[PDB]
């Protein structure tokens, strides 16, 4: 029965784990918002081959995923879960946590995202040949940007994105439910102190994160059927294990 002190300590613990694994400093992301790819540079990206652009994006996503893996390893309660469940939670949740974290790198004012040193629009990614998915991802980042999460709120929310007791294949669901509930108390407690409980009703609906993840897997399938050798030769093995069917 998590006491008030234990809940307060859980808040601090979650925020600490996030701060140590957040990948890019927010201050750096925000100061870079003025650095936007030129028309010429956008053209260059649009002229890249499908394979090269996927390969680059696959590498960048894997880098982000590695930070989320570390976040999980440092998240209190997570390493205490059975190994099977650790894997189930990360395989389903890693991409979902990156998608949420990404809103930090998204500028709602001009609909650009930080990518390879500058900010660019969704048309930057045209060579991928998955523009509906990219458009849906930008839309998602835009919806989250309207909540204006603090770093601590991202920490606590992404903890719950990961520690999701409804994932299929959990062998010890009760232990996940219990950690999930304690994380919810931590989240609610922090929001109550900051008068931000209103955001709970405005969080991404049921199935949204699942849809973006499923589409990513589907679009990878389409690419991999068209370019099988590239995926085998050049894609990060972790990316293949998480997403290749």
């Amino acid at each position: 029965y998590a006491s008030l002190t234990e809940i307060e300590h859980l808040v601090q613990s979650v925020c600490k784990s996030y701060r140590e694994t957040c990948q890019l400093r927010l201050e750096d992301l925000l100061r870079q918002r003025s650095n936007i790819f030129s028309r010429e540079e956008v053209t260059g990206y649009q002229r890249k081959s499908m394979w090269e652009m996927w390969e680059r994006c696959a590498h960048h996503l894997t880098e982000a995923i590695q930070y989320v893996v570390e976040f999980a390893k440092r998240l209190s309660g997570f390493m205490e879960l059975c190994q099977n469940d650790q894997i189930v939670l990360l395989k389903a949740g890693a991409m979902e946590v990156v998608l949420v974290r990404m809103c930090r790198a998204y500028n709602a004012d001009n609909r650009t995202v930080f990518f390879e040193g500058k900010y660019g629009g969704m048309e930057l990614f045209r060579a991928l040949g998955c523009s509906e998915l990219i458009s849906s991802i930008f839309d998602f980042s835009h919806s989250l940007s309207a909540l204006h999460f603090s770093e601590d709120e991202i920490a606590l929310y992404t903890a719950l994105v990961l520690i999701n007791a409804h994932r299929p294949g959990l062998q010890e669901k009760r232990k996940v439910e219990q950690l999930q509930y304690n994380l919810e108390l931590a989240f609610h407690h922090h929001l109550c102190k900051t008068h931000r409980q209103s955001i709970l009703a405005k969080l991404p609906p049921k199935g949204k994160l699942r849809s973006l993840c499923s589409q990513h897997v589907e679009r990878l399938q389409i690419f991999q059927h068209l370019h099988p050798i590239v995926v085998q030769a050049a894609f990060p093995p972790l990316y293949k294990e998480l997403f290749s069917t």
Partner: peptide, 10 residues
């Protein structure tokens, strides 16, 4: 899940 397993060690 060879890779994820390895990442979770230590």
């Amino acid at each position: 899940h060879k890779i994820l397993h390895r990442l979770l060690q230590d």
